[model samples]
Target: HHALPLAGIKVLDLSRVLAGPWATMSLADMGAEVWKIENIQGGDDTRAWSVPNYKGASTYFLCANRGKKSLALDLKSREGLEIIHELAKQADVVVENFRSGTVERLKIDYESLKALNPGIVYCSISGYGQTGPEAQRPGYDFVVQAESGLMSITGQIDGEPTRIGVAMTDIVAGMVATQSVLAALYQRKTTGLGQYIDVSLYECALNTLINVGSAHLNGGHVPARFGNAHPTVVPYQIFECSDGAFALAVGNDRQFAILCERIIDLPELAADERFKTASGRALNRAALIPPMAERFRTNTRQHWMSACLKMGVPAGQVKTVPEAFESPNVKARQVVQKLESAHLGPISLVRPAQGLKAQENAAYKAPPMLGEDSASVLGDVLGLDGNKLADLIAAGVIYQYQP
Candidate 1:
């Protein structure tokens, strides 16, 4: 609790699977005490989203689910819903990723919980949003990427739209939900009132367009996709080489100067007033990029990297996925760590990519097993005695002490 920003905050995370779980994962990472209330019948949707344990668990689930206590409770049952109301009263935040109207059906929507706790910060995540043309429609990352014009800008020239290798849309939506929760929490402090937050994968997908969307809105024209090359940043793209592809990106005059003189071996280009500044080359890249593009397209992968070895320009190889992960610098920075889990011993995972390294000896516990902390979390937070907890377990309203 010393360095953790959210030590006293309690979150009732009713979200499931990636987008919802990811939002809670951020909260948990920031030191919030997160009680992941999963379904009684099967736990999280990701419990069955893998192949290793009757498809009952996944490394995918294990990655983001760290630092949470799994509380398996059936929302369909009256007693189970009562438990939710009790937990809501105790929680500072309540987050869910249900489709529109699903919470109303379960009687746990924002309005219902605000009745129980006026200052409860309630957040909802969905494919679209709480209300929209597509609010009721099912939305997933891949589908929304295509629906939101994201795919229109993702693929190569004269090729089919390529979905990102990962579910970035969902992750972004989760981040949106996370930031919204933080803002609502801050507002609660000032006004003494909690508010409803609506987040969606579909809209979040569009928000992710960043300069792509803003450029269009500001200029009344859609920027054409240029494969790996940025629409605005000159010479910031992948280049084909003899052995494979190499990447060369020069963001500013200093880097471009270093690149021209040292790596690209076109030293005179640095003095050219046309390419002297960032915008100078950016607005006039057609004359500059094609020349180097042709040079790299005719050179070998190693040749470009070897030239970059001496000059500290922003250029490197198009390493294979595994190569990038295993590269020497990444190892030196200790970005990847191997932790031994009681459930799945000694798996390597990427470190949390934030100021998470501020503290020592408390990055994570292994991702939990289903109902892994039911008894202890209940006793510790809710003050439920063992006998009463046993009664709930026996009645099939909750699960306890399962791996």
Candidate 2:
């Protein structure tokens, strides 16, 4: 088989939970060999985060940790620290998300690892960043979303501030971390040296605010919640039809004119002084929306969607999660892939959103159970024999997956 872009790279993953795991999983997907170092006691925190699980493995854990090997060890143990030092000597990258002083206290910070491997691309994911007034504060996705002003513009008009359904801050932070790591690796080729990357969920959250934050920064325009409706675009929002809701986006005045004349059969409204221009329509949304809402209530979602499709106005049904998966476009993209886990049986996961041929060449590996590859990794990397491996396992410093 041909090599993926990161085929020869080795990643020592010390991060857990969403953001760190998400970043490492992307590296693994791109053909990096990632050894996920977890605590021997219970492994990753997400291992017990169940309710939505398969064969006792939490779906939350499965979602972000595929194509990686689990090496559960107690970081406090001397043998475990020795194993980590050995791994650090060969690792191309190291990812950790320990709060402020934890890594330094454990002697796994960038300074310590760089002493062993100067070319190691070390990344630390945190809540506020490595150095800041609030750097010591623990970062969680929910609180970051709120503190970053994302929650300020999320909910319905007149409604309370609300967070998005998913952990957007964590997801974005992961993507940022992955991008930073890739860039650092590329830079390593020139200098033969790797540098430290500090990523914060709070900063990433602010970065994702996009136009909403831009308005406030560039124009001093305070943003407010609009919920499913667009703050500027008049018809760019979810509309409730006879059966269900569908999204519609009238991007220009021409589309607005067509929507009024052909779809809604309200040509006169298009010519009205208060609704003539895009700005006017936005300014007079209250007057324009109720009439459109009344018309939409007279038809089914599909009927309006079909009309919008033919008319060249953008629209789509507000599909449920299952409905979205069942979409013909989703199936055509081959977005779902299945792999057999020796412990968990056959499991399904979403394929990488990116369509890189190199990524496609990377072989799929199921997310490892706690310490599933402990013995194998130790043997292959450190040349630890069965007797030594058995001793470590007996010492409770390392855990080899049973069954």
Candidate 3:
């Protein structure tokens, strides 16, 4: 038999947007049976988010919702809420990211679900957690980045603080939630008790601040933005070239000397009193970077990268998103994969970060249309007959894709 870690596990994904979808996607990637329950009318809001729309499905939706089944249920409807109750009774895990009173108002809170299934792992992803002044306050990646002080430390020293190009906080929170879920599963093996996991995007972002937070906590000084440059390391910043740009990282004096001798081809720079040591280089970065910038401006990014690679100086071309996906390393890793989408022909999506050595990695499944698997999920899990399923659909409590 194929070894699938979470083959028998069942997950009920009642979350939408990024964080919750990301967590459920990770679980689904690991072979858990994930059922994504969306609202009856429009489904997930992300389904409509952007250009290059493949059929009616949004690219953003496809990015985080692959490898799962979809079921549309109007939680506002009593019958729909009852259907979810029935499903939760059989689910091994139940996750949601609704506002504070929302889930409870719908009667899908952890305590309520636990009454149905004591062994169910209930996890909730929220903006500021279940408690706190900002608990129910709406939270987004940009707002959290600002509140957590991440934006205050990013970008060029003289430039304005910037939000990360991606929704890193939400993604990180999702990963943390998934990690907690896995740990709970392990604990349940021996203890036979399910646990409640509370993951907050704000907390996750603050926790990720790491050294930045430490620097301020230990001392009273806050680190300033340095753009593509390393805060503590010299010559570890993106340098300009004739055609494009590249990053150069000189971790030690030996590497710095090599960088000067081979990549920069300026042996004299290696012995300069002001740039001799890493500390000196850091202090004299204003004086040191200009000359190197002038030198780099004489060649293209590819030329600099090749020369640096030959000299064993850590360097790389600053690639665009498309270029990154097409890079040799990315291709070797098989990070991007294709799946057949009913709405979008063949669509590409990225797989989970971790790889399994002992077990065969699970394949990617296409992101489903709204209520794509409503009938099957209802029949298989709740034993709802076909006639009843049609009645529910006709009553507007449940929905499914039409052939």
Across 1-403, the per-residue lDDT of candidate 2 in tens digits comes to 7677788899999999999999999998888999999998888899989878787779999899989899999998988888999999999999999879988988898999999999999999999999979899999999988889988888888898898899989989999999999999999999999999999889899999888888889989988788999888898899898998999998888998899898878898889988888899989999999999999999898899899889888887777898989999779866777877879987788887656786654558898999999988999988999899889988898998889
* Residues forming the 10-long window of minimal summed lDDT in candidate 1: 353-362
lDDT of 3 by residue, 290-333 (tens): 88889999988998888888888888777789988998877887
- The reply for model 2, stretches above 4 Å from the true place, is 272-277
Query: What is the Å distance of residue 360 in model 3 from its true position?
Result: 5.9
In the range 209-278, model 1's lDDT, one tens digit per residue, is 8888898999787667778888877778888887888777777778888888877678778888888887
- What is the TM-score of each predicted model, taking all chains together? 0.91, 0.96, 0.94
Runs of candidate 3 exceeding 4 Å displacement: 50-52, 272-280, 358-361
Assess the local accuracy of residue 214 in candidate 1 as a C-alpha lDDT between 0 and 100.
94
Candidate-wise lDDT, in order: 0.81, 0.90, 0.87
Q: Alpha carbon lDDT of residue 167, candidate 3?
A: 98
Q: What value of lDDT does candidate 1 attain over all alpha carbons? A: 0.81
In candidate 2, residue 278 scores what lDDT? 88
